[PDB]
Design a binder for this molecule. Structure first.
Ligand SMILES: O=C(CO)[C@@H](O)[C@H](O)[C@H](O)COP(=O)(O)O
Ligand code: NA
Lengths: 426, 598
C-alpha cells in the first residue's frame, strides 16, 4: 500500500522542481545558440532553411521531393502576399523519369540524376541559390544518409551549394504544416518514439547564421538535454539502467525520460522492483517479464485507458505469463501512470522554457502563439495530453497558447507539407 | 566603429596615425607601438598582440582629425566599386579580355591564389577563365624565396606583355604593400604607355607620397614617380590606386602578415562585387563584415593557437621540423607560410615545409609540375609519405589543415602513420554550422583548433566567401604560429628584425633604416658601416664606393650576420673585425647589441 506509493514517488516532481528544469533548459538553449560554446553544448540549436528574411524568403517556402518507381516530382512551394496584401501560398511542380541505369546503378548516380532534376527546375523557376527548405519522400520498387548523398551529388556538380541543415525534420515539417492553416503557429513539437522541438528564433539571436534581421526556425534537438550532466539530479536509478542497456550509453538522456521508446522499459523495471519486494505477483514473475523490451510502450497506453474491471490489463499480463490479481493490476496501472506523468510534466517544462524565452525576447506582456503538435504518445496516450496542456499553461504565465494537431491522413515530412500546401492553394 | 556597423572590437588609435611618428619611414616600414616589447612575451601574449595588429586592418578613419585613409573610408570604398565595374567589362567579353594579378613574394603567391579562386568561380557557372597571375620567379618562387628578382622593372614589363598577347582589354592589378617593388613599377609603367588596352590598378597600403623616390637603378623613374603618374590618371578615371592605410606590422617589414591579409581581403571583396553585379556601398560592407567574422572566429581559439605556437617553438629548439599538411586550397596557404620562413627568419628550407592535396595539380601553376627541380619541390601528401615521413622523430611537429567536407577516411589513416613516428600532431579543422567532428578523429587527436562557420545566405557567392573565410583564417593562424615561434626562439630584437640576409634593394635600405634608429648617426654614416661589413675592408676603396646597390646585394647575399656586425661597429666605436669578434664571443646576436647599446 504505502510501500508501492514510496516506490512510485521517485517519479513525482513538485511545481518548484519543474521551474528549475525549464530554467536549466533555457540555459542550454542559450549555450547552443552561441557560436563559442555550440561545440560542447548538449543542445545544438541547429539553424534551418525555414526563415522569414528580408531577402524574400518566408516561412512555408519549401521544395518537396518525391520518388516513386521511376517517377520524380519536384514541388515548389512559395508563400507571400497578393495584391490586397493578404496571406497567400502557391504551388508548382514538374515530373521526371528516372533512367533505368540510374535505378539499378549505385546510390551515387541516383542522387546525381536527382540533383540534376533539382538544378534544372530551380533554374527554370530562377531559385537555384535561394536555399529553400528541403524534404524527401521515397518509394522504391519491391525486389545524414539521404542528405549526405544529395550533398555529395551537388558537390560533384559544383554549380550551387547546399548545407547539412537544408533538409528539415518531421518536427519542423509539423510547424510549417500547422502554419499553413494557423499563421500564429511558430512552434513545432513531436512527442512520439523520440522527442524534439522547433521554434521561430530572432535572427540576431542565432549566431550560427550570419544574419541580423528576420526570423528562422531553430531545430533544437533537445533530446540530448542532460548529456553534459545538467540533468543528473532528475534521473532515477531506472533511467540509468535503461541508458546503460541502450545502444548509446550517455546520449539522449532527456529523450529517454519523456520519449515513448523506453516508456515501457521504465514501467517494466519498476514492476520488477515491486516483485522483488514482494509487492507484486506474489514475488515471482515469468521469464518473459524479466527480459528487456518485453513490456511494450503500447501496453502502458492501454492500461491507462482501461476500465475498473481491468479487462485489457489482465489480458496483457496474461500474455506476459502472469495471473495478476485486481490489486496487482491496480499497482501496475499506477506504475504506468507514474512514468507517463513524469514524461508529460518534463516535456511541458521544456516547451514552457521555449515559450517563455520567445515572450521575453519579443517584448510582449501577452504572447499570442500557436503550437503545432504530433507524435504517438501525444495523440494516442490518454492522460498525457491533458497533463501536458495543464502543466505548460501553469508554467507559461504571460502567454496565450493554442494547440493544434497535425492533419491526420497526410503522412509525415514533405508529404505532410505538400498536402497541406496544396489544400491552402485551392 | 561609429560610422559603419562592425562585429569586432578594434584597438583605439593610434600613434602611427600621427605624421610625427617615425616620419623618416613610410607606414609599411614603421614599428607598431602596440608591440614595442614583443621580444619578451609568452605564447599567449604574442597571440593577443598579433590579433590586435590584424584587428587594425578593420579600423575606420576619423574624418575630422585628417589622418590616413583606412579600409572603411569613402574614397577607398568608392575606388573598390570603380575597379569592380571595370572588372565587369572584362567579364562581359571573356574572349578578348583578361584580368591580371601581379606581385612579388607573398603578393605574388596571393595573386596566384586569387586568380585560381575566381577562375574556379567562373568554372562553376560554366564560364571561361579570365584571370592570370604574374610573379617574380616565376613559378619557382611558389616553393622558394627569390627576393632578388624584385628589382627588375624591365623583366616585369616584358612578362606582362607576353601574357596579354592578343588581348584587346586588360585590367592589370599590381601589388606592392609596400610601393617599393621595381618589378611592379615597371609593369604599371608599361600599362600607362599602352592605355588603349591596359588599365593599371595599384594595390598597396602606403600613401603615394610615401613610395620610394629613389631612382630605380638601370631605369628612368622611381616608384613614387611612376605612382604619381598613375595618380594623375586616377583623378581622370584612367587608372586606379587602391591604397588604404592598414598600419605597421607586428614585426616591422613583415608585409606577409597585415599587408598580405589586407591584400586578400581588399581584392576578393572587390572581385566578388564584380561577379555579383554581373554596385552599391551596401555590397562591400556585407562582404567586409564576413571578413571581420573571420577574424573573431579565428582568435576565439587563442588558447589553442598559443599551444600550437609553443609546440612549434619547442620543436625548433630540439632541432626539429614543422610539417604543414593542407587539404585543398588550405594546402597552398600552408605553403605560403612555409616559404617565408627562409628569408624572414634565416631558416633552412628543411625547417618548415608545406604540402598540398594533391601536388601541383591543385596549385594550378602555369609551369606545371616542378618536382624535378629538386627535393624541396616535392610538395604533395604522397611526396610527404614517400620521402619525409620515414625520417621524422619525436621532436618533429606535424600539422593538419582540413575541413569537415574532406575525405575524413584518408585523414584518419594518415594520423596513424604520423603517430608511428611522432606524438606531436596538431589539427586545424574548419566546419560549417552545424556539422560536427566524429568521435573517431576527436578521440584520436590530442588538441584540435576547431573553427565553426555560420551559414551564409549570400546566393551563389556564399560558398566562395566561405572558402575565403577559411583561407584567411588559416593564414592568420599560420602567420601567428610561425612568427610567434621564431619570436620565442629569439629572432626579434624589439618589434623589428636585426639579422637578415640583404637579398634586394628594399632590404638594403631597411638595413640602413635599422642602423639609423639604433644609432644617432645619419644615413651617410649608416651606409658606410654597412658597406664596411659587407666587403670586410675597413676603408672602402673606389671601385666599390661607386658600385651600384644591386652590386652590394650580390656581395652581401653570401654574408652572414651582416647587419648585426655593422650595428655594433657603429654603436660602439670599433673596427668591423672587432665588432665581428665581439658578436662571436656573445651568447646571442641580441645580447651583442644590448651590451653595445649603452
Ligand atoms: O613577404 C615578404 C616579407 O615578409 C616579402 O616577400 C613580400 O612579399 C615582398 O616584399 C613584397 O614586396 P612589397 O609588397 O613589400 O613591395
Ligand atoms: Na544571426
Amino acid at each position: 500500500q504505502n510501500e508501492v506509493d514510496q516506490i512510485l514517488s521517485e517519479f513525482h516532481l513538485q511545481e518548484e522542481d519543474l521551474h528549475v528544469l525549464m530554467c536549466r533548459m533555457q540555459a542550454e538553449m542559450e549555450r547552443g545558440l552561441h557560436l563559442e560554446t555550440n561545440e560542447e553544448a548538449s543542445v545544438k540549436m541547429l539553424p534551418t532553411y525555414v526563415r522569414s528574411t528580408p531577402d524574400g524568403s518566408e516561412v512555408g517556402d519549401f521544395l518537396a521531393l518525391d520518388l516513386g518507381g521511376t517517377n520524380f516530382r519536384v514541388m515548389l512551394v512559395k508563400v507571400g502576399e497578393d495584391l490586397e496584401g493578404q496571406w497567400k501560398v502557391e504551388t508548382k511542380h514538374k515530373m521526371y523519369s528516372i533512367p533505368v541505369d540510374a535505378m539499378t546503378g549505385t546510390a551515387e548516380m541516383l542522387f546525381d540524376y536527382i540533383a540534376e532534376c533539382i538544378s534544372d527546375y530551380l533554374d527554370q523557376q530562377n531559385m537555384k541559390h535561394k536555399k529553400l527548405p528541403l524534404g524527401f519522400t521515397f518509394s522504391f520498387p519491391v525486389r545524414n544518409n539521404v542528405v549526405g548523398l544529395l550533398r555529395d551529388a551537388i558537390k560533384r556538380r559544383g554549380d550551387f551549394e547546399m548545407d547539412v541543415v537544408a533538409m528539415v525534420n518531421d518536427t519542423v515539417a509539423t510547424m510549417i504544416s500547422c502554419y499553413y492553416e494557423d499563421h500564429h503557429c511558430e512552434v513545432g513539437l513531436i512527442v512520439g518514439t523520440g522527442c524534439n522541438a522547433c521554434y521561430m528564433e530572432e535572427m540576431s539571436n542565432v549566431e550560427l547564421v550570419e544574419g541580423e534581421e528576420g526570423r528562422m526556425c531553430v531545430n533544437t534537438e533537445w533530446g540530448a538535454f542532460g548529456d553534459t550532466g545538467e540533468l543528473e539530479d532528475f534521473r532515477l536509478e531506472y533511467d540509468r539502467v535503461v541508458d546503460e542497456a541502450s545502444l548509446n550509453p550517455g546520449q539522449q538522456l532527456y529523450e529517454k525520460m519523456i520519449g515513448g521508446k523506453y516508456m515501457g522499459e521504465l514501467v517494466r523495471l519498476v514492476l520488477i522492483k515491486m516483485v522483488n519486494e514482494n509487492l507484486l505477483f506474489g514475488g515471482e514473475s515469468s521469464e518473459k517479464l524479466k527480459t528487456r523490451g518485453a513490456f511494450e510502450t503500447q501496453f502502458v497506453s492501454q492500461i491507462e485507458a482501461d476500465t475498473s474491471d481491468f479487462k485489457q490489463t489482465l489480458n496483457i499480463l496474461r500474455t506476459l505469463g502472469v495471473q495478476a490479481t485486481i490489486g496487482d493490476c491496480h499497482a501496475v496501472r499506477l506504475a504506468c501512470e507514474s512514468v507517463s506523468t513524469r514524461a508529460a510534466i518534463m516535456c511541458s517544462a521544456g516547451l514552457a522554457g521555449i515559450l517563455n524565452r520567445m515572450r521575453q525576447s519579443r517584448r510582449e506582456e501577452l504572447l499570442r502563439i500557436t503550437v503545432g503538435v504530433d507524435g504517438s504518445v501525444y495523440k494516442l496516450h490518454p492522460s498525457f495530453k491533458d497533463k501536458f496542456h495543464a502543466t505548460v499553461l501553469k508554467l507559461t504565465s504571460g502567454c496565450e497558447i493554442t494547440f493544434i494537431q497535425s492533419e491526420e491522413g497526410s503522412g509525415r515530412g514533405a508529404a505532410l507539407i505538400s498536402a497541406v500546401a496544396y489544400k491552402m492553394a485551392v | 566603429t561609429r560610422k559603419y556597423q562592425h562585429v569586432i572590437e578594434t584597438p583605439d588609435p593610434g600613434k602611427w596615425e600621427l605624421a610625427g611618428y617615425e616620419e623618416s619611414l613610410p607606414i609599411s616600414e614603421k614599428s607598431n607601438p602596440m608591440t614595442r616589447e614583443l621580444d619578451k612575451a609568452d605564447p599567449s601574449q604574442l597571440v593577443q598582440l598579433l590579433r590586435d595588429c590584424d584587428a587594425e586592418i578593420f579600423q575606420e578613419e576619423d574624418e575630422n582629425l585628417i589622418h590616413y585613409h583606412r579600409l572603411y573610408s569613402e574614397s577607398v570604398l568608392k575606388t573598390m566599386g570603380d575597379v569592380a565595374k571595370r572588372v565587369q567589362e572584362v567579364l562581359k567579353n571573356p574572349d578578348d579580355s583578361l584580368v591580371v594579378l601581379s606581385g612579388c613574394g607573398t603578393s605574388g603567391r596571393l595573386a596566384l591564389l586569387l586568380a585560381n579562386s575566381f577562375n574556379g568561380l567562373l568554372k562553376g557557372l560554366h564560364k571561361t577563365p579570365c584571370y592570370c597571375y604574374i610573379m617574380s620567379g616565376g613559378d619557382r618562387s611558389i616553393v622558394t624565396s627569390q627576393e632578388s628578382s624584385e628589382d627588375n622593372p624591365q623583366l616585369g614589363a616584358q612578362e606582362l606583355e607576353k601574357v596579354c598577347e592578343g588581348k584587346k582589354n586588360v585590367l592589370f592589378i599590381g601589388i606592392s604593400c609596400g610601393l617599393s617593388a621595381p618589378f611592379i613599377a615597371g609593369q604599371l609603367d608599361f600599362c600607362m604607355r599602352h592605355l588603349d588596352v591596359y588599365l593599371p590598378v595599384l594595390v598597396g597600403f602606403n600613401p603615394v607620397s610615401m613610395a620610394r623616390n629613389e631612382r630605380i637603378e638601370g631605369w628612368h623613374s622611381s616608384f613614387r614617380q611612376v605612382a604619381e603618374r598613375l595618380q594623375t590618371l586616377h583623378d581622370s578615371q584612367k587608372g586606379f590606386i587602391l591604397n588604404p592605410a592598414v598600419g605597421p606590422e607586428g614585426v616591422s617589414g613583415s608585409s606577409r602578415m597585415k599587408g598580405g591579409s589586407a591584400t586578400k581581403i581588399l581584392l576578393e571583396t572587390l572581385l566578388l562585387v564584380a561577379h555579383k553585379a554581373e554596385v552599391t556601398e551596401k555590397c562591400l560592407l556585407e562582404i567586409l563584415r564576413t571578413y571581420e567574422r573571420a577574424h573573431k572566429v579565428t582568435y576565439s581559439q587563442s588558447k589553442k593557437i598559443a599551444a600550437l605556437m609553443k609546440q612549434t617553438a619547442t620543436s625548433l629548439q630540439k632541432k626539429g621540423h614543422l610539417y604543414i599538411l593542407g587539404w585543398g586550397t588550405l594546402g597552398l596557404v600552408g605553403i605560403m607560410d612555409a616559404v617565408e620562413c627562409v628569408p624572414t627568419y634565416q631558416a633552412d628550407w628543411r625547417d618548415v615545409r608545406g604540402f598540398i592535396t594533391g601536388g601541383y595539380h591543385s596549385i594550378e601553376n602555369k609551369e606545371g609540375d616542378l618536382s624535378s627541380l629538386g627535393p624541396q619541390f616535392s610538395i604533395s601528401h604522397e611526396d610527404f609519405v614517400k620521402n619525409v615521413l620515414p625520417s621524422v622523430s619525436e621532436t618533429d611537429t606535424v600539422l593538419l589543415i582540413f575541413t569537415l567536407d574532406d575525405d575524413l577516411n584518408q585523414i584518419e589513416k594518415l594520423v596513424a602513420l604520423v603517430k608511428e613516428k611522432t606524438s606531436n600532431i596538431q589539427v586545424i579543422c574548419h566546419a560549417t554550422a552545424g556539422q560536427y567532428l566524429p568521435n573517431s578523429l576527436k578521440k584520436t587527436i590530442p588538441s584540435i583548433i576547431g573553427l565553426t562557420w555560420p551559414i551564409l545566405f549570400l546566393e551563389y557567392e556564399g560558398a566562395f566567401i566561405q572558402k575565403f573565410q577559411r583561407e584567411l583564417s588559416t593564414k592568420w593562424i599560420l602567420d601567428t604560429v610561425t612568427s610567434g615561434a621564431y619570436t620565442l626562439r629569439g629572432k626579434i630584437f624589439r618589434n623589428f628584425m636585426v639579422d637578415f640576409k640583404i637579398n634586394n634593394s628594399k632590404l638594403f635600405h631597411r638595413a640602413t633604416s635599422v642602423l639609423q634608429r639604433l644609432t644617432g648617426q645619419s644615413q651617410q654614416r649608416c651606409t658606410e658601416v654597412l658597406l664596411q661589413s659587407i666587403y670586410g675592408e675597413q676603408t672602402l676603396s673606389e671601385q666599390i664606393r661607386n658600385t651600384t646597390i644591386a652590386g652590394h646585394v650580390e656581395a652581401a647575399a653570401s654574408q652572414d650576420k651582416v647587419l648585426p656586425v655593422a650595428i655594433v661597429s657603429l654603436l660602439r666605436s670599433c673596427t668591423i673585425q672587432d665588432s665581428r669578434s665581439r658578436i662571436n664571443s656573445s651568447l646571442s646576436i641580441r645580447s651583442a647589441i644590448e651590451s653595445s647599446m649603452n
